[PDB]
Amino acid sequence: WWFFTLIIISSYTANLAAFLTVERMESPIDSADDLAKQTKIEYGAVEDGATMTFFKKSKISTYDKMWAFMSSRRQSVLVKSNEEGIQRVLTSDYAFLMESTTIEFVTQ
Amino acid sequence: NGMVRELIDHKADLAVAPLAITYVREKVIDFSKPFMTLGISILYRKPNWWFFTLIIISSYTANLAAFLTVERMESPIDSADDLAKQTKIEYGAVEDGATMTFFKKSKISTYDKMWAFMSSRRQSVLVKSNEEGIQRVLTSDYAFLMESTTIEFVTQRNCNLTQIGGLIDSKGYGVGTPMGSPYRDKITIAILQLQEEGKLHMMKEKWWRGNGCP
Amino acid sequence: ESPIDSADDLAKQTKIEYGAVEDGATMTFFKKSKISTYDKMWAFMSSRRQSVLVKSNEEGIQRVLTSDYAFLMESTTIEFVTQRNCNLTQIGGLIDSKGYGVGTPMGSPYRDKITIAILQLQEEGKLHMMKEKWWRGNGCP
Ligand SMILES: *[C@@H]1O[C@H](CO)[C@@H](O)[C@H](O)[C@H]1NC(C)=O
Ligand SMILES: *[C@@H]1O[C@H](CO)[C@@H](O)[C@H](O)[C@H]1NC(C)=O
Ligand SMILES: *[C@@H]1O[C@H](CO)[C@@H](O)[C@H](O)[C@H]1NC(C)=O
Ligand SMILES: N[C@@H](CCC(=O)O)C(=O)O
Ligand SMILES: N[C@@H](CCC(=O)O)C(=O)O
Ligand SMILES: N[C@@H](CCC(=O)O)C(=O)O
Known part of the structure; x- marks a missing residue:
């Protein structure tokens, strides 16, 4: 019976x-190409x-494919503020595209 | 070839059919304002000597x-991505x-990756119509890209099936008029009247109504 | 590790490297x-032009039997080679359905008399009979 315990730990291992x-293997969303x-x-920017x-x-083929996703999902991904961009990241899965400085207001 | 080819040849002044909103379908015929929404999604199946023995248990481990x-590492399908x-x-859609x-x-990146798979396999993964689409799902390993209102009807019927993924896109079902008719706008005011009285969504549970499986 | 199965693989x-009969x-x-799968395959053969496009089906056999090379034959001449030589296999499937044909000049008067001479020739059952007289390359599994 000790040999039966020797197998059930192997399937557990x-x-x-x-x-x-x-x-x-799982890498989170690091870069834009990721x-x-x-x-x-989903993506998003300030509309206009x-x-x-x-x-x-x-x-750029990396950035042109990103535009095709935001043009297709037009009425739901392009929020109209930087404020609604903060709300939609804090809610469900959403990666908003700010300028570099207004990151450091929000990420502090 | 099919509907719109007959419409631009001025055969069948009305078309009424599953004609959907597509930008290339709008250029050659101005077909009417739609009666019911649309979204493409996947119809994949719903599933179902002490050292001597020491090497052996390390070999089996x-x-x-x-x-x-x-x-x-193999992912269960819950999107168009995976x-x-x-x-x-060997997923595919209705040919033409x-x-x-x-x-x-x-x-877009992922859907062009889906088209790269289907164009290499134009002979195999493409079907004639949705009936060829339903049977290849039920028999073989396949995941079919039928449009929205055919999804819920067959999943109520075949409880072996399910809807995988949300709406890939958004469309509607229009009515084909030859090139743009003045009679088109008579239909547009008519459909606004027929949905206002509820008989649009009253014939809904008259003809889909496939009783489902909880 | 999956070996080279399909053309998209x-x-x-x-x-x-790839290769076809030149012209x-x-x-x-x-x-x-x-097709975006096949257009990217052409960019590799156009860039490596003087070394990947051999000029025969025979030099195609030599270059697969040597170093790493996937030659692009028609479907039938596979089964001559993949039964005469059991070191080579058909990886993939049919890329595009074609058909061999007796070539006559433009507006040739003989074209309508070859076509009837072929449609009689398979109903007599000799396009299948002349088939299995040359494709029986020893039956090598
Ligand atoms: C149940 O699983 C088997 C393989 O384990 C598979 O062949 C079969 O199609 C599945 N049943 C259904 C209804 O898909
Ligand atoms: C669908 O499911 C039923 C039972 O729920 C089964 O008898 C039938 O064979 C299935 N059809 C398929 C897998 O095509
Ligand atoms: C090629 O096939 C022949 C026939 O089976 C075999 O004898 C030989 O070892 C294979 N390999 C080479 C490198 O010739
Ligand atoms: N600074 C940007 C707005 C913020 C953004 O789009 O990231 C502009 O001038 O449009
Ligand atoms: N509604 C589609 C047919 C059904 C489908 O392809 O899913 C069309 O107009 O072609
Ligand atoms: N049968 C082909 C030649 C062989 C090949 O290119 O695979 C032709 O007519 O050009």
Whole structure:
């Protein structure tokens, strides 16, 4: 019966090695190219701003694919303030596209 | 080829049918303001000597470690994303439909990755219509990109099925008029009257009504 | 690790190099296709032009049997080679359905008399009979 305990710990170790592996391949959303592929975590900018205009008029293949997601989801991802951008990140999965300085107001 | 080809040839002055809003469908015929909403989604299936034995239990451990890892590494489909990153499922849509028209002429990253899979496999993963779409899901491993109102009707009927993922896009069902008729606007005021009296959503539970499975 | 199964599995890697018969129907198809999987395959063969486009089907056999190379034949001449030589296999499936045809000049008067001579030739059952006289390459599993 001690040999039967020797097998049930091996399947427990194999189950534990399976779960510890898959959570250590997982990289969170670091960069824009890490953010350009996934369509779950949705994007957004201030509607009629310098950031919205830049993604519309860029030729970079990473940034042109990001514009196609925001143009398709138009009425729900382009909020109209920087304030509603804070509300939608604090709620469900959303990566808002601010300028660099107004980050450090919010991230402090 | 099909509906709109007959409409621009001025055959069948009305079309009434599942004609959907697509920008290329609006350029050659001005078909009417829609009666019911639309969104493409996936219709994948709802699922179902002490050292000598020491090497053996370490051999069975690592092989069971790897087998459960790759299985856990394999993702269950709950989106169009993981459906696009997995070439084991051989997903497709209606050939020459508004669905494949959408995945072709869109430039978003994941759906262009879905069109790269379907264009390599134009012979196999494409179907003739939704009936060929339903049967290839139920028999083989497949995930079909039918539009919205055919999704809930078949999932009420076939409880082996489910809807995977939300609305990929948003459309409606219009009515085809040849090139843009003055009779089109008579229909537009009419549909606003027919939905106001509720008979739109009264015939709703008359014809879908497939009793579901909780 | 998955080996090179399909063309989309073969479209990404630039180590395992590609190749077709230079000035053939397969080389012309990849040049004049709009599929994003097949257009990226043409950019690799156009860039490596003087080394990947061999000029025969015979040198295509030599370059697969040597270093890492995935040659792009038609579907039938696979089964001559993948039964004469059991070191080579058909990875993938049919990329595009084509058809061999007796070529006559433009507006040739003989074209309508070859077509009837072919549609009689398979109803007599000899396009299948002449088939299994040359494709029986020893039956190598
Ligand atoms: C149940 O699982 C088997 C394989 O385990 C599969 O072949 C079958 O299709 C599943 N049942 C349904 C209704 O999909
Ligand atoms: C659907 O499910 C029923 C039982 O719920 C089963 O008898 C039938 O074979 C299934 N149809 C399929 C898998 O096509
Ligand atoms: C090729 O196939 C032949 C016939 O089976 C075999 O003898 C040979 O070892 C294979 N490999 C090489 C490098 O020739
Ligand atoms: N500073 C930006 C607005 C903020 C943003 O779009 O990130 C502008 O001038 O449009
Ligand atoms: N509504 C589609 C047909 C159904 C589908 O492709 O999902 C069309 O107009 O082509
Ligand atoms: N049958 C082809 C040649 C072989 C190939 O290119 O695969 C042709 O007519 O060009």
